[PDB]
Design a protein around this ligand. Structure first.
Ligand SMILES: Nc1ncnc2c1ncn2[C@@H]1O[C@H](COP(=O)(O)O)[C@@H](O)[C@H]1O
Ligand SMILES: [Mn+2]
Ligand SMILES: [Mn+2]
Ligand SMILES: [Mn+2]
Length: 284
């Protein structure tokens, strides 16, 4: 499929600027794109301009960090108005503790025998307030402390390992409501990554829907084919719309393309058509 509704830019943890990531996606002749940076909309105006210039329909997007019980989950919004005040304030409240947490992650790694990780991570991060475990991982790989990204999260930056600092993100109710109140659809991102069996997934979906959630990622760069099959069925039982995204961050860690949705799925983009920013001004 030539649709991609999930990816990142230097606004949060992606390696490419909003212009660069859109331009890269554009090589695949995509029919629709949505930039979804973590807990931030700062790249949307640039991404929109870059998409329109290449003749590509575009949706405003975001990826919101949520703590649900002991789990961190990510809720994507699509078709949001980033200027809506409640959403803007909510996202800001989620970013607030990020820098503090990062200094602590660095100090944790230092206690475990790797000094200089906060500073190193910062070298990879254009916007200090968006500082992320992703930047720490790039540092650990680039500086040769760890051989690759996969090995980083095996030894570090996860619960019980040096560099991980527990943190409370948005509530599920807040994340979904901010998205919906901004005119968008809320989407459970990359559900196959969560440590949950079919019972917890069902519980998450029910809570998600109660809060106003309508969508779930079925095609995802983070999903196996078995994942796609399994989450297509979860979506169908609850009447959720299916989203697709690459979750692209960097080259060699692709944007503008996703796996075709299973036939059972109701594609979320069909429901977002009124929120699509069209390349032709007159069509908006
Ligand atoms: N196992 C993993 N492999 C690669 N990247 C990861 C992994 N786990 C987390 N990340 C990245 O780290 C980000 C989370 O950082 P933060 O929001 O500061 O906790 C995610 O959005 C991913 O980009
Ligand atoms: Mn990320
Ligand atoms: Mn995510
Ligand atoms: Mn993501």
């Amino acid at each position: 499929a030539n649709i991609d509704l999930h990816f990142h830019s230097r606004t949060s943890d992606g390696a490419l600027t909003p212009t660069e990531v859109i331009d890269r996606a554009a090589a695949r002749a995509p029919a629709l794109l949505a930039l979804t940076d973590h807990d931030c909309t700062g790249g949307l105006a640039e991404a929109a301009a870059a998409a329109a210039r290449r003749g590509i329909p575009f949706l405003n997007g975001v990826e919101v960090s949520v703590s649900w019980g002991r789990h961190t989950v990510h809720i994507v919004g699509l078709g949001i108005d980033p200027a809506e005040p409640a959403l803007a304030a909510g996202l800001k409240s989620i970013r607030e503790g990020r820098l503090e947490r990062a200094r602590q992650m660095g100090a944790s790694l230092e206690a475990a025998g790797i000094a200089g990780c906060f500073d190193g991570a910062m070298r990879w991060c254009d916007n200090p307030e968006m500082i992320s475990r992703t930047h720490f991982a790039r540092h650990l790989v680039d500086s040769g402390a760890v051989k690759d990204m996969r090995t980083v999260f095996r030894k570090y930056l996860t619960p019980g390992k040096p560099g991980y600092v527990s943190h409370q993100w948005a509530s599920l109710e807040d994340a979904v409501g901010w998205i919906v109140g901004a005119g968008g659809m809320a989407v459970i991102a990359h559900p196959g990554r969560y440590d949950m069996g079919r019972t917890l997934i069902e519980r998450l979906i029910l809570d998600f829907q109660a809060a106003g959630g309508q969508g779930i990622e079925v095609a995802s760069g983070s999903h196996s084919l078995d994942d796609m099959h399994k989450f297509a069925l979860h979506a169908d039982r609850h009447g959720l719309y299916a989203s697709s995204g690459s979750d692209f961050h960097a080259p060699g860690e692709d944007v503008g393309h996703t796996e075709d949705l299973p036939p059972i799925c109701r594609p979320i983009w069909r429901e977002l058509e009124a929120r699509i920013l069209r390349p032709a001004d007159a069509e908006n």
